Ligand binder design. Structure first.
Ligand code: CL
Lengths: 64, 67, 67, 64
């Protein structure tokens, strides 16, 4: 699915299939993703995170 | 060791220990970092990248050619 | 920042700026480094890896899952 | 081809197809290689380096 997120306050979008590492501090879900061959980063409030991304977050937390 | 750069026209400084990824496009060094629970992204010219950051870049590029 | 380890039963110290690659096998942290024109390899338990070296390990593992 | 080399003074061997970065300081040709999914390192005197490895060294020097 598509994730709408901010990086340096700018609105961007990426498919969840590109997402590689996910974590949460307070309301912010931060993640790294494959940005056409190099890493990119994003930030999304937890309330705005799609089901698929929340699933990734909880899996990543289980792996910590 | 601090990396000083411009973030949306504002002067910012980030400790190298906060840097999570670094990449290069020509003379530009792009870095992703932790900032108070968020990820931020900065860019510096290679001349303004501290040696510690350039060493991270060389490791990242070596890891990318391992396969 | 120095990494202190045993190299063929001898006490050795290497500056983190000399480290070229780092990997982990269980609790073992393996690192490849420059030493007077040669590459050497050391191993430390993760408890004896300085935070700077553990940060290099986390970057290497992130670069390995980018693809 | 096979390269016979030393790491921490111990004799090892690896195929040149695994070699990834090559450089030389004095008589020592040092290199990194893919060691079954993680990097390994080696050192070989230039006089003991096979043709294939010397070719890699000169290419790497041209890229510096
Ligand atoms: Cl690094």
């Amino acid at each position: 699915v598509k994730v709408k997120f901010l990086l340096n306050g700018e609105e961007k979008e990426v498919d969840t299939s590109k997402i590689r590492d996910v974590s949460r501090q307070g309301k912010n879900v931060k993640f790294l993703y494959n940005d056409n061959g190099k890493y990119g980063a994003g930030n999304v409030d937890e309330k705005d995170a799609p089901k698929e991304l929340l699933d990734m977050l909880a899996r990543a937390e289980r792996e910590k």
